[model samples]
Each structure stands twice: as structure tokens, then as C-alpha cells.
Target: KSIPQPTNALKSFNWSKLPENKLEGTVWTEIDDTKVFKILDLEDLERTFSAYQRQLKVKELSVIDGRRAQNCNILLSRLKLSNDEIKRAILTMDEQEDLPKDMLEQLLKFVPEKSDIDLLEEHKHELDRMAKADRFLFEMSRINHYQQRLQSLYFKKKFAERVAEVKPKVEAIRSGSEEVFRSGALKQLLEVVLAFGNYMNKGQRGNAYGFKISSLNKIADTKSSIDKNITLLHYLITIVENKYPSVLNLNEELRDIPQAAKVNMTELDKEISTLRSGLKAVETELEYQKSQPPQPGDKFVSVVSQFITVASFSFSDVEDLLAEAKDLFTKAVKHFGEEAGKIQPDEFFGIFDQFLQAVSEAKQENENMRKKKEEEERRARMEAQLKE
Candidate 1:
């Protein structure tokens, strides 16, 4: 006898009959009171269905999809081969059958020709060309990499020297005696700032110090009122030409200012006071060393003395030293034509000429190649027609 089953057992459990919005609302309410849950679920479902439809349309439109599917089906069918059948195929081999002597002699007369040697020679030539091209590219890359490294090292060395020279002085002023502030150092600082500004602006603007250094490059980038010149530098030069009459001569002063400013000692007292504090620290260390002299493996006192001597002398001749520095800086600036000798008319013309030459050469080469190809095509067609 068959067992009795309840009719409503599976049929009464119907989740699909629930309204979509109500189910979503129930899920939103059940998932820990987060208000965004229902909205997010709805958005996710919409997005998923929309994406599925888009993908379906794309597959329907693309011939690649149909071809790929057919290829996959073929591959799957092939994969369904029995393991025993594969093993039998792998083990099977054709039996050798004896041939008559006359038939064998005829087969020997019909032996195939060897063409692999010629094909290999052709392949070798192609490989050689590819290798040469790769080697050339590698060499070019190496040269560029080394050049960049060398340039970086050179700039870093110069930057390091500048920092070493300036750091001690800055530190002394910042941490040393109050007397340092009263020294001519403020004037020297102003001079340095002014000098750099003037040197950077000489060609374009007359020896003016109050302008922002950030504005220096903008002078070259800006356009003149008349639209004839492309920068404020040019405009200033024009103004100098018209108004001050001989203001262009002021550019000579701009070149000297940065060099001269480097030596200005209005900050000399400050530098001196700072140096004195360093000297005091050294003296204290030396006294302590004398009281508790180290055993044989210790460093020599001469090394510390040498450092003190060098530092003392470097800071001692403030006024005279600065004056000399100012002279040297002035000469440098004057020689360079200010803007620190950054702008060069000759360089600009050379670059422009090279660009034009490159364009002309490329155009000429392209035309020649086109003509050669046309001539070759015409010759080939003529030869084919003559043969016909």
C-alpha cells in the first residue's frame, strides 16, 4: 500500500505570490534597522537585470559570441571521448607490408626533394634583422638612462654644497645670541633676496628688488599690451626704452646685485655672535676632554682643534670677506646678462632651425618613398601584362 501524503504540504509554501515591494520592505525592516537596505536591494536588483539584458543584447549582436559558443561546444564534444578509446588510439600503429622489388625501385626514383635548408636560411635573415633592431633600441635606452643619472648626480652635488655653506649660518642666527639679530645680518638677508630677484629679472625688468620671485617667470609667459611681444619682460624692456631713455643700462646693475648681495654684512654681527656660541661649545668640550683624558684608542684632540680653527676663521672676517664676495658676485652677474644669463637668443634660433629642418627632411623622405612604391607597382603590372 502507498503512503498517504498531505495535498497542501508543498503547494502552500509560495514565496513568489508575495508582492515585490512588500517583500523588499520586509527585507529592509528585518536587516538591523538600516534605512538604506530596501533602497539598496531594489537598486542592486534593477542594476543586475539591466546589466543582464545589455549583455544578452551584446551577445546577440556579436558574431564572435556565436562562433566562440560553437567552438566551445565542439571542444566539449571532443572532450567527451572515452578514456579507453583514447588509450587504444595512442597504442595503435599501422603494420608494415612487404612490397615487390620492382615497386620498391620505382618508389626510390620518386623520392621527394629537400627544401628545409632554404627555408631555414630565410628564417635566419629575419632573426638577424630583429636582433639588430632590438640591440639598437637597448643601446639607445641605456644611453638615455645613464645621461639622466649623471645629470641627477651633478645637480645633487651642487645642491648639497649650497646647503652645507648656508645651513650653519642659518642655524646660528636662529639659535644663537640675541646680539646676532642686531648685526648687519638683516641688511645682508635683504641684499641676498634682492640680488637673486634682480639677477632673475635683469633682461626683462630693470634692477628692481620688490617684485615677487614667483612673478619672475610669468614676465616671459605674459603678453605685452600691444600684442607684439609675448611676455612682461619684453614689455618692460620696451617701456624702459620709451620712458627712462637709458633704463636698459640698468640691466647691467641687475647682473651685479646677486653677487654683491652675497657679501653684504649688515648681518655680520649676527653671524659673529652665532659663531661665538659654537666656539664656546667647542671650548667646553675641550675642557671636559682635558680633565678626563681617554686611553690609547681614543680620537686625537688635533682633529677637534682643526675644526674650530677653520670655523673661527670662516666667521671672523665678516665685513672684508663679504665685500670681496660682493665683488665676485657682481662680476658674475654682469658677465651673465642677468636673469642669471638664463635667456639666450642664439639657443632659441638654433632649436627653431632644427625643428624646421626635421619637418622638411621627413616630408622629402615620404615623397621619395611614395614615388619609389608607385614606380615598383607600375613595373610589376607592366611585366605581368607583357607575360599575358
Candidate 2:
């Protein structure tokens, strides 16, 4: 006789908040009802498990793709692989319609089949061949992949080093300017601004800590507001009106003085030194690379040369740029007089213009795309309804 099938017990309890009494078996029959107590059917359970497994597989594939793409990009950047080599690799990976039957048969040996120890032993040579082929393919692509990874690492390191060196100097200048203004030292304040601007802009022009007391003549030449009533100088004037009322009359005091004194040349010298040190670090790295023999198949000599040329120009003129910045700061302070204590018009305008331009462009692009998508959706819905 066949074994007796178990019967399911009738039990009712709030699934969301099952009571302690019901959970304690007060409403349950204890005859091994696990076989009949099915929350999901076999097909549904299989599908659910398959979906979870698929998700895991997809995540694995994504990680592999990221690694591969990064390797490719670095190789291209570093010029490890020539254009022809890259084309060959792409064709092999992406364009091949099918694999050789022998290769496919060999690859299948890598997959396990159920309990046939003899069969596995018989196909061991085929599995070995597949492993050899896999290694050969990986080796063929390794140069490009490794070079790409190296380039990515190099750029990231360079960018981080630059930020570390420049950020502190910028912060110090900003802090010094702020402190001078807060103390109501209008002359010192003007000196700081002039020092900064001249220091920054001096390379192009002659050392300009003393902008003509008359270039107060060009204040009207820098108009910007929509009404055109607001010149760049006027914006600085308004800031003085609002924040530094005490310093507004500074330019008038300057006119009575016979000669303008040069800014603290020592401090300016130190700033130039700091900039040079930062640049030197970048140069040292590039130079070190040049001294080394090129790796096999390497072709990035021209790229490295371009990078060196740009860096050399920037470092060589560091002092001049600092001087220009100092001159411009002095000019800005003189233009606003005592009112230079207010916000920096150039900095404000620089930040504002960048932010406004970015936002406006983004908004326009998004609006256009949104209208296009809406029209497409409308047409799609109309077609669907008509079909229904």
C-alpha cells in the first residue's frame, strides 16, 4: 500500500500581527504538515530564485565590464597599443559571429557534468586546451589593459597633488584680505587687494602695484547689469556703499600722496616660491618619466612632450602672474577707495557668471528635451488608445 498523504490543518491568524496564542500551536495541528504548507508554487519559487541568481550574475558582469573598460581607456591614453592593435582587439572581441566548433567543444570541458568520473578523465586534455587558449587571449590584450590602468592612476595622483598644493595658498590670501577689512584698516586693505591683483596679473603687464591713479578713468568702461547702468566699477562701488562705508573715500586720500609705495616685495616673493614648488613637483615627475627608457610597444613620447611644454611655460611665468595679481588688487582697491572693504567685485562676478551660465544652459537643454519627450509620449498614448 502507498504511504498515507498528510492533511492540511485549518488555521486562521492575522498574518501581519500573529498573536502569541496562535503561534504557540493553539490553532495548529501537529502532524508534519510542512509538505502541504506551501506559500509559493514550485514554478513561482523557481522563477523567484532564478531572478535573484540573474541579478547576482548581472552585478558580476557589470564589475567585469567596468574593469575591462577602464583597462582599455588607460591603454589608449598611455599609447601602449597602436591604433592597429586596438582595432584588432575590438574586432576579435566584438565582431566575431561564431567560435570554431573545436574551440567550443574544448571550452565545454570546463563545465562540469553529473557523476561520470570516467568521462571527465577522458576529456581532461580538451579542458587543458581551452585553458591554454583563454590564457593566450588574455596575454594578447594585457599590454593595452595594463597601460590604461597606469594612466588612470597617474592622472588621479597628479590632480590630487595639485589640489593639495594650491588650496592652502588661496585660502591664506582670502583670509589675510578678510582680516584687513574687518580691522577697518582701509590703507592696509587697499594694499592687500592691490598686492593680490598685481601679483596675479603682473606677468603680462609690467609689475603694476601702482595702476595709474587716473585709470579711475576706465570705471565707466566696464558695464554689465541689464540696464547697462551697472558698470564693473559701479558694482564695486555699490559693495562699498553697502559694506565698507568707512573706506569709500580712499581714492581721494591717495591723490594727495606724491608717490605710491611698492607692496611688500618679500611676501610677494614667498607666494611665487610656493607656486614654483608646486609646479616643480609636477615637473620632476614628468622629467623622471623622460629619463627612463620607453617600455616595449610604447608610443606616448609626443603626448608627454606636450604636457612638459605646457607645464614649463606655466612654471616659468609664475612670478609674473603673481605680480599681475598684486597689481590688479591694488587697482581694484584704489578704484573703490575706502569701499574696498565690501565684497570683491571680480571674485563675485567670476563666481556668479560661471554659475549663471551653467544653470541657464542646463535649464534650456532640459526644457527642450522635456518638451520633445512629452510630445513623443502623447503620440504613443494616442496610438495605443486607437489600437485598443
Number of the top candidate by TM-score?
2
> What lDDT does candidate 2 reach at residue 141?
34
Q: What ranges in model 1 sit over 4 Å off?
A: 1-164, 167-236, 242-245, 256-279, 293-299, 318-388
Query: What is the lDDT, from 0 to 100, of the residue 18 in candidate 1?
Result: 51
lDDT of 1: 0.36
lDDT of 2: 0.40
Instruction: Give the lDDT of residue 273 in candidate 1.
Output: 49
Candidate 1's TM-score: 0.23
- Per-model lDDT: 0.36, 0.40
How far in Å is the alpha carbon of 158 misplaced in model 2?
14
- Write the residue-wise lDDT of candidate 1 on 8-83 in tens digits: 1110111234565676657644655345443455544443332112222231111112343344334334334332
